[PDB]
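fwd from M.: "can u put these together and see what the complex looks like"

so here's what she sent:
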Amino acid sequence: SEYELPEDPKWEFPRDKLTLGKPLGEGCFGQVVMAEAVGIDPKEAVTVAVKMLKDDATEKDLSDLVSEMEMMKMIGKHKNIINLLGACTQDGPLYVIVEYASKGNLREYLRARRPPQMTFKDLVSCTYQLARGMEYLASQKCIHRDLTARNVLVTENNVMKIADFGLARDINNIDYYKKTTNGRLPVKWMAPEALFDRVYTHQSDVWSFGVLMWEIFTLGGSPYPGIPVEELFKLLKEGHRMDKPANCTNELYMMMRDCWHAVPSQRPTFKQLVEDLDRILTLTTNQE
Amino acid sequence: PMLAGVSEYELPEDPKWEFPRDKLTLGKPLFGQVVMAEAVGIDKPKEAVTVAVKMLKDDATEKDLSDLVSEMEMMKMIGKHKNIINLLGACTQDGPLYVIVEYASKGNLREYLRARRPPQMTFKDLVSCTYQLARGMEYLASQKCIHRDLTARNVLVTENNVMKIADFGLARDINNIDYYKKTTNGRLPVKWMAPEALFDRVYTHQSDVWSFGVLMWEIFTLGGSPYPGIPVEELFKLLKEGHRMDKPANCTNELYMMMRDCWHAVPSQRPTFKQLVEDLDRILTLT
Amino acid sequence: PMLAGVSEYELPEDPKWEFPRDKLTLGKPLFGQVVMAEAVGIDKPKEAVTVAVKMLKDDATEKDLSDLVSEMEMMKMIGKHKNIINLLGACTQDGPLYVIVEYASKGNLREYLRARRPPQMTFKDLVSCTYQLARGMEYLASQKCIHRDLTARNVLVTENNVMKIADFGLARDINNIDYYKKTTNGRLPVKWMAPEALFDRVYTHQSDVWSFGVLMWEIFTLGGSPYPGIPVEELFKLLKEGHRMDKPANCTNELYMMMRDCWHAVPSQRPTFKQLVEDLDRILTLT
Amino acid sequence: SEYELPEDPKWEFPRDKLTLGKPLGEGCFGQVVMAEAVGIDPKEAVTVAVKMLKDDATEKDLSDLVSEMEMMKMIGKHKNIINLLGACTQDGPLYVIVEYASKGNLREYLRARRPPQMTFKDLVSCTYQLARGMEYLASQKCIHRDLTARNVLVTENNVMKIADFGLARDINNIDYYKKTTNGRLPVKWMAPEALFDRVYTHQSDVWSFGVLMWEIFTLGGSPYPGIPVEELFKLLKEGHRMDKPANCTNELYMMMRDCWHAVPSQRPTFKQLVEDLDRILTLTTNQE
Ligand SMILES: CP(=O)(O)OP(=O)(O)OC[C@H]1O[C@@H](n2cnc3c(N)ncnc32)[C@H](O)[C@@H]1O
Ligand SMILES: CP(=O)(O)OP(=O)(O)OC[C@H]1O[C@@H](n2cnc3c(N)ncnc32)[C@H](O)[C@@H]1O
Ligand SMILES: CP(=O)(O)OP(=O)(O)OC[C@H]1O[C@@H](n2cnc3c(N)ncnc32)[C@H](O)[C@@H]1O
Ligand SMILES: CP(=O)(O)OP(=O)(O)OC[C@H]1O[C@@H](n2cnc3c(N)ncnc32)[C@H](O)[C@@H]1O
């Protein structure tokens, strides 16, 4: 065969049962399009999203798409993680078929529902759902490395879905100590040890989660407003951190600041973040 | 003297190229982002000229930042040429990095050609476009630079329909070092890569000639996508097996043989950019 | 609770594998350095056993440190096996990283065989050595590890002449990820690399089978150097052209066909380690 | 041809005029052997050193050897830089032919001439020669990146020769800002910005020179005695530096400490180091 990907029958989807449709957008690393997959699971046609390469794809783009597919299989299913539905890997272009999220990414979702709509309780719920998704990811021995609001999708029923696992790693046995340089990660979401010390652990993902929390409570704001990525390397070393969002309580801001402790072991674990957010969410949810 | 900690930024000064931030007004958008802008005095010290500004986005990675800085550095090394987008200035101190370059009102070549397909491009125009690009590459090669990302999407077109080679973020300076067996090329567009760039960890001017051949095919197909119907996923093996693209409809046998020569498996058997310029000049004259 | 700044070291704890520094006495030397040592209680809690300790040198690089840590991590993943050098313990806290492993009194296989060439090795011994190594690799592959650096110099021999696969610094865990198109392999020994590892940015268990074939050749030549008279400098092109090593003098047609099968260009056409073990067991029994 | 290296006639040496001899040692990345080259320059046979690959050479080893050859051609000739004499690049294994230094590397040279022989003036002279070599290298727009005593050779006439350019880079036009990760450089000779900030400049080589100075004045001592490379990353960030060698004056120790300023622009330039060392050397040299 002229193709290269190995067979994995349980996940393979027939190409003649997939109808590609409207493009959902370009990621410079490939493209996602809406599609109809018959019997992907009932011989019913369900709307899905398909990720594939563009004509100017590089070997890194191809390896990233394949890595994302492999990581999703390892992670497994979870309410707060975009679900892998199947793939077309044989006799043709690589198609990774995933759950379609009609409301788009979290940043645009929040920006479109700003006040002159999102309620404070809705923001806490979003944060809780994502903490649960990350707590699950970490328990599956996966480090995401690219947790941003743009990389979270929202379903028609407003469910938060962590997505974009192309940069994620499997740390079940190897932790890449001193060999993960991290030059392809978004600087404004990176923990200091990821930027300077060639490591990346679950605690580094906790730092990114703190930045994601800030994005949520600013209803889709861009991190470190007015501070170019160009001067952030030295500012971070100097202890500078983002300020408190207007629609954030002291308790939630202290949580963000704790995720940003310089010492990784001083940051909360995702298990602890889930416990605290469950308490806060419950108390902010009307019980009448 | 300078006190310590005056700037938290990192780029060194280069006064001759530095442009005042207060003289630049960023406009509508057009790895990073490019936006139109007005630059006062970059040319008449009071006249505002329309330019393009490349900068980082909020989700910039260290590779993105190093690529933008590398592009700026390569443009200074290469120097000015009619068929290369020219660097006009840069804001590198006390703020975000802005690389200011010539604005090309007609967009990239791919789109340019696609929008001018028969229902306004003439055969002579296609040959002219190809010759201009061969001249730009001959100059770039003489300046000891390998571009590595030559595609029609990376060629811009000005108001006066001048072809401008752009996007030097992946380019390398091979004046003294050639990166033999240490350039893995995983960030280059597969459909434009020579076999030795894909498999053998090298990249020479002859690898750019292979890319030029693909660009020629894109041009004579009026912005068509290379290896139609062939996924990049199976191209690695097809290329080793000797497969090559077919002749575009609006292409003469002479021009197609030129493309095929750029795709010889053995790099030294491909023409040099100097030879391509000489041949295209002759063809253009006889057209 | 723990106060901050108690340790300036970086490795996380793993108690079950940690060995007391005061129970380890470093001896004479044997990327880093390996030295003999005496470890009290690593086995009788009062008995000192002779072991080998791998550690960094004063000119260690971050790659050297990450490689030593990776080797330690891979050995824990792989688990114990008769034909794999076993990990005994490690000192990772409050001091230099010491990876403590089984001491093999007879050195590496290359030297072992060279010192036993006819003026004490028998044909049966060579087959036995090969089978033992096939068994070790079959186990490693079942544990979803790709070694990537299988050479006779990376095989150690114990006092009881047991073959032990060693040097897991370049090994990878492919339980869930296979590194497709992202493993460039520039740090692997060229003369032991499968063509797809050299040219196609992949590495699978079938690539280790190719290396195993080269190891078989090293074994039946009593520690000879692969591709004699052929510089690594011209091997890239020779390999693409289909060239393969000749049959060693002390090798039967059957064993040579096995080597040639490990060197099939198409990876799926090579035997699996499981098949190699089954075939070698039969040959060994008929010898 | 089955080989890959391009021709460069002016430097090519005939293989039949080169006789390989005794091995000078293994560098794990290749091997160096003594040899006789006839007419390499007079049809006289001069003793030279030849660097070549070993049978287990990797692609990095091959690319490093070729890079070293290319860098030496760019640097040019200098009294304090090991001289490239020629190479055999066609129709056979790559041989890079260089000046033979009979006294070996500087670390062993100093250790073999310790006191129960080196004089203090000799140590200052060694340091001055190396500063001159580096001042020249930097003016040629080259960053060495691997300046250690083991990487300095000494000739029969006690001339200091900077060697091992396999990790060096040409920064005539490109400076590799934020794209030089430096994971293959010896940690104990690395400036903090080289370790943490993905950059490498001439000022980073000045830091390494300070460590080399310490090696010289301890007569071949190993840097950061008793401090494992494993804990140096955090100790460096915390401002820790090596102590003053016994046979070092306050003036020379202040020079070392200045080479180790955390801020690169605060370190002296090689031009300044050469000027100060020339003064110190002159004053320590008997003028009777
Ligand atoms: C941030 P980027 O690299 O563009 O990210 P990507 O290219 O994956 O997505 C491009 C567009 O398609 C959207 N998108 C990606 N995956 C899905 C999906 N599964 N369902 C709905 N929209 C998606 C994404 O939010 C964005 O609007
Ligand atoms: C190939 P890519 O990564 O999209 O390239 P880039 O990130 O520079 O995208 C810039 C967009 O604006 C266009 N563009 C880039 N530079 C200029 C310029 N100097 N003048 C006019 N248009 C430009 C370019 O063709 C594309 O449409
Ligand atoms: C192939 P290399 O990089 O030399 O490999 P290494 O750096 O481990 O060198 C170690 C030296 O001591 C030998 N050696 C390594 N490990 C052991 C061991 N566990 N027992 C006995 N000898 C060993 C090894 O064969 C070589 O001679
Ligand atoms: C530190 P390493 O990697 O072994 O360094 P290398 O392998 O280049 O050198 C190995 C041995 O050969 C010595 N050597 C290298 N080059 C020369 C030379 N040009 N003249 C004399 N000895 C040399 C070097 O000092 C050491 O003793």
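replying to her w this: The CA atoms of residues 68 and 166 of chain A lie 4 Å apart.
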